[PDB]
């Protein structure tokens, strides 16, 4: 149908149990707060939020449920750079040239680790900084973004 | 003309000496290239090899001859002091800075960072609901952040 409220998540599960379709987003796309989208099975689905969390779409967020049946946002995975830095110096250091750059950045999964979408200057950048990094397929989820 | 530094004030240095001072603004620390006229009036030319690649920094001897020294001096300008309570806030702080592209520098213990007076990042900062406070006082060029 034409979905304007968040459901809650899969994360506060659900063991599923459900039969659970997925709309798949680019983590770029997770902030549509009016838009059309056709699920994997191919539903079609309109989106016109209110109250969109700020943040954007997370992983998991349920769209709809009606019985055993739902659907879920999922954000594809993308090239990811991985930095891992070293101290707090390191930290304000890194988050200020990409910040410069302009580049999306994201918390990693520790205190030390941050995530940006890969670009060739960025990674230019890191490199010539001699910060740690790795470049992952993995996934930018939303409530992780540094607001900016 | 000025081609090579001869150390800083710092390592002392009991003065003892009869210092003269180049006035600086912070933004002008980087020149390797340029004249000045120091506080006594002196003409100064500066065409540095191997300027420190952060710019000149305070109490940085530009000339010693017997008792007589020329010295850098960065003049103070408001400087709005922030004060991190996190990892997590020390990121967002210096990205979102680095955002706005603001100058940054380190300050004098972990969590705490310094950055010219804007009201555009005094607006920010206060909208990320950060601690700070506005002090005139000096952005020594050794502390910047790269770039």
Redesign the interface.
């Known amino acids: 149908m034409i979905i304007e409220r968040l459901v809650g998540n899969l994360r506060d599960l659900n063991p599923l149990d459900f039969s659970v379709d997925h709309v798949d987003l680019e983590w770029f796309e997770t902030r549509k707060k009016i838009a059309r989208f056709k699920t994997r099975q191919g539903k079609d689905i309109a989106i016109r939020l209110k109250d969109a969390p700020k943040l954007g779409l997370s992983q998991g967020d349920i769209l709809f449920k009606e019985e055993k049946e739902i659907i879920a946002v999922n954000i594809l995975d993308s090239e990811v750079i991985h930095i891992q830095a070293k101290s707090?110096?390191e930290?304000?250091?890194?988050?200020?040239?990409?910040?410069?750059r302009?580049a999306a950045?994201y918390?990693g999964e520790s205190?030390?680790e941050?995530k940006t979408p890969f670009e060739k200057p960025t990674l230019a950048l890191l490199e010539k900084?001699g910060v740690q990094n790795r470049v992952l397929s993995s996934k930018l989820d939303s409530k992780e973004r540094?607001?900016?």
């Open positions: 707090v110096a930290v304000a250091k890194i988050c200020y040239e990409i910040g410069n302009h950045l918390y205190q030390f941050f900084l540094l607001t900016v």
